[PDB]
Amino acid sequence: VDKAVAFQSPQVGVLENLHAAAYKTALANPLYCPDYRIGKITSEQLHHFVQNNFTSARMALVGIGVKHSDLKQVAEQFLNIRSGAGTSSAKATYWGGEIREQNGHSLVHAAVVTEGAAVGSAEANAFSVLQHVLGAGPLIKRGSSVT
C-alpha cells in the first residue's frame, strides 16, 4: 500500500525508472521495494542491515530547540551498537540506459539527464545555477516563467 499511494504521482514513476536506466548499482536501486520482494524480506535481513549500516560514524544526532550539553549527554551515555563504519556502499557506476513505461495516459512524464556532479563537489553550484538559468520551479501562482 505505502507504495500504492506513492505511485499515485507518476512524478515518482519515472523517477524510479530513471535512476534504474541511469545506473547499474547502488543509486540504481529503487526507493520503494519492488513487488516481488514484498513479504519476502526477513527479520534477519532487517537486523543485519541495521547492525551493518546504522553505526556511529555514519550517524549524527542533530536537533534544534535544545542546549548542546543535553543532546550530548544523551548521545554518549545511551548510544551503543555503533563504533565503526560498517559495510561500504558499492561504488555507483554509470549505465546510460533508457526505460519506457507505455501505459495509456493523457500525460507523458519524461526526464532525460546525464551524470551531473556530486555532493561537496566544486562542479556542483554550476548546475545548481545552470538549473535556475534554465528554470526550475515557479514563483508566480498560475503564471509563466519569463525568467
Partner: protein, 442 residues
Amino acid sequence: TYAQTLQNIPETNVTTLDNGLRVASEESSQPTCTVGVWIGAGSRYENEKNNGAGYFVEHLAFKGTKKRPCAAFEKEVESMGAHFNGYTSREQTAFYIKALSKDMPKVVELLADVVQNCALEESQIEKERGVILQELKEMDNDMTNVTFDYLHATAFQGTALARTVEGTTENIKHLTRADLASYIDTHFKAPRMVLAAAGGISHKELVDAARQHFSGVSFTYKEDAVPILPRCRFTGSEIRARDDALPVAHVALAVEGPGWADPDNVVLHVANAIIGRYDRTFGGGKHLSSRLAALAVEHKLCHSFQTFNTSYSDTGLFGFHFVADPLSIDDMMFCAQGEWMRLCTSTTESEVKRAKNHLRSAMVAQLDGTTPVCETIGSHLLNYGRRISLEEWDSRISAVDARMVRDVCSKYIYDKCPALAAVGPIEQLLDYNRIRSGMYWI
C-alpha cells in the same frame, strides 16, 4: 524551557493607517521574510450574478497591472527571487509575497499595485476563462472537496455560504471586464485589509512603505464603514450524490459552529484533538490513541477520516469526514457518530490532557516559517480583531478540562439536526432519520 519561550516571542506590532487599512508584523532575526495583503473578501460577499468574481480576480491578479503588464510584472518578481502566492476562500482572500528582507519595501509596492491598479486586460480574460473552466473539471474530481462544497451547499442552502468559491459554470462563462472590476472596486478597500509581515523587518520601515503606496484616503464616513454581512441559516439536512462507479465513498457530517469570536471554539478544537485523524498510512495503526482511529483499523472501517472545526465570522461547521469502501460506510459512520457522543458523555481527563498537548503542538506548528505567520496574522486581526499569542492561546487551553468539554460538545452536538454530504457508492449510508438519532444516547 516552554513556560518561558512563550513570552520571549516578540509581540506583534499593529498600527492603523488614517485611511482605514491596517499594518502588522513580527520581527525576527531572519534574512528572508514574507508579506501580504489579507483582504476580508470572499465568495460569501458575492451574489447570484457575480458568483466567482473573487476567484476570476485571484486569477488575473498576477497577469500584470497598469503600471507594469504581464511580462514586466512577472519578470520583475521572478528576477528578484520573490514568491508571489495567494488564495481566496468564502470569507478571506489573500495575496502575499516571499522574499529577502532586503526587498521588504519594494515588495509592498508590488502587493499594493496588484490589489489597486490591477491590469485586467480584457485580452487576458478570455484566456483566463478557459483556464478556470479547466480548474473546475479538475477540482471536480477531488471528492474530499466536492464533498465539503456539497456539505456547505446544504448546510447553508439559500445563503451566501452555500456557494462554491469557484462560482458557477455559467458565471465563469459570462463574467465581464465590468463585474470583475466591480468586485475589486467594491471589495478591495483599505479598512477591509491587513498588511501583514514577519521576518527580518522593522515595523517602522514597513509601516512607512505602506503609508507611501497605500495612500488612498477616504473622504466620507461610508468609506470607513465595514459592511456587516446578512447571516446564513443553518439547515439540518443532507445531499446525496450517488455514483456507484466511484471507487470509494466520501461522507461529511457536521453541525452549526459558533463563529470565530466565541471562545468555545478552543474547546471544540481540544475535542477534535481527541477524535483526531487517520489515513491508512499512519504507523501507529491499532495502537493509535484516537478510539475512532484504532477501531478504523481493528475493523478496516475506512481509508481516512478527519475532525474539522471550520469557523466563519458569524457561524461555522463542526464535524468529520471519512472516505471508505462502499461496504464499510455504515459501521464507520456508526462508530464515528458514536465517538462524537462519548464526547458529550464520558470524556476523561486523560483524553483531554492528551488533546491539549496535541493541540499545543498543532498551534505552534501553524507558525513554522514566515509565510505561515503572516497567514495567521493576516487572519487573527481580520477575524479576531487583535492578534492572539501562543502564550494567550496556550493558557486558554490549559484552562480546559474533561468536564468543560462534555459541556461544550453537548451544547453544539447533542440532539441537533446535522448536515450530511454523501458522494459516491453510498448505498449503505442511508436514512437521515437514523443518522439523526445517532445524535443522542451513548
